[PDB]
Amino acid sequence: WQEEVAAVVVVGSCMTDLVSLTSRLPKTGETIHGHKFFIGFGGKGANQCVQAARLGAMTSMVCKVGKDSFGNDYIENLKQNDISTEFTYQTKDAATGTASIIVNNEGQNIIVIVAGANLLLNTEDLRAAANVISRAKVMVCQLEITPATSLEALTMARRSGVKTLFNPAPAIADLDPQFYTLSDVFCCNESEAEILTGLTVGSAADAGEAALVLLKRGCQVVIITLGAEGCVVLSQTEPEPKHIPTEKVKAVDTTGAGDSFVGALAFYLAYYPNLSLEDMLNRSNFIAAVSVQAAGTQSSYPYKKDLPLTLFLEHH
């Protein structure tokens, strides 16, 4: 008997985060000593997948890691979060992707990303995932893997009528035009928006303007997250920007909040399709805001059993 399908498929990155906490950031040629080191699980794709899974989504992570200790440990992390690893591949040709992060006591950081194995996730690897993709409700992609691969995944999703949620992160100024036209929901932050559009974006009104450019490039729904100001949304049917504020909380660590938001949104798009988009975004704001109230990235992302029941009910 054919079992429950994954409703949320994430094609994207897994990165081992190698974090050192220090009291100052080093300069060229310097050695410095920090006071704490830890390994965390990151990568935009996996962050998003994990948030959606913890909310109860059945998910499948399509990604490539290394045939190495960090890749075996990432696979176990996915499984622990009840994520299908059927299309989590391993390769000996490159190490699992890494992010080396140095963070001083003011939260300023230096980051060196080596994408590694993530970049060897190829179009044949996606084709083997075709039946899972075609049965999904939502496909989520970012800009951490090879762009040809992500383009293919969005293409495959469209061909089966699967909703596409694209997060253009990290952003680049000459993004292939297809990424706008293949996105049903296009979601980025202020700094990404500024890179994509060339406009200065430092307010919800500014984000409104930038969103309109992204819409005219061929997006259907455009969401710009705004940190503690919440998010702003527009769409082809309602092109007037709608600012969706979020209640004032005292942040502990905002790292990974955007991924929390996107994963929440993927969950809602997949399991609650009749909610209004404004409702989905209020809920996604809420969930991301819970994540900013805890340290870490993925270890901050809330589970369904710790969130209020009202986040899982149909509209009042």
Add this chain to the structure above:
Amino acid sequence: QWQEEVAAVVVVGSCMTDLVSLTSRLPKTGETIHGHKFFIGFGGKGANQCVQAARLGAMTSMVCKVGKDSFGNDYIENLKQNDISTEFTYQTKDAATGTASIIVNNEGQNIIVIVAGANLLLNTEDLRAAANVISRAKVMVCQLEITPATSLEALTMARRSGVKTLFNPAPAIADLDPQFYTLSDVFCCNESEAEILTGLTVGSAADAGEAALVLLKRGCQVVIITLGAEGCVVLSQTEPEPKHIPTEKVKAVDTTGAGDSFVGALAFYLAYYPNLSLEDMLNRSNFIAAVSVQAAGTQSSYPYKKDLPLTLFLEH
């Protein structure tokens, strides 16, 4: 056991996992950059020294503390692969294995963040359980990448048993307890360490000669200051006139870890060739350290006895 060969060189000191990312530029505050390769290597001054000695044929034992974690288990396998005893390599769940996060551009310039972690939990009770191995050694080597009190106690234990002490005050500490000098049979440091320890400007063999005498007068029996490509300068209580021992000119590939190669070669000679003159030991140690600078990769650059000329192992 008593009639068989025991560890002649016991190193009480540090082990660090090197987390290396290759990039084309070094990042600055706030920046995220991408590199093109990530790999894991083995470092820490104590383990580096031990590895060089072992490779030259010494029977060695590494007294150190790593984490009860993957990097600790791997560090232990690295020690064993290099025929080093890990009887007193401890593992703790209370901190992670020491790490060095190293970012290296294409010119070989680097930023390095060290988190000493587990190395700082090596304590006097750990040394007490190692007391019999320490007491039976010919040479005990320590540095300053563990708690200084612990290196001091190791030095003390060695002196109580008549074991030769080789102290590398690296990285240096400006208010180093005076007892360290009185417990050091051979005190070996580099120019920049000598400057921190003495307050003198040290940028030449002649400057080093002066700083060395300051160190000798603090109570060291022998003082050696390494000088990079200029070789080393040595003095002793018996012969307080500086002797500059040059090294033949080679084309360096990577000098990282050269001082540890020199120290480990010296420990080897002190333990297995005690009838050589010191000048001879230092000529040979310069040579071996100069071999290491001609290859990439720190411990992976440290030569083995079978690849070195026969003249390095001939007797008095």
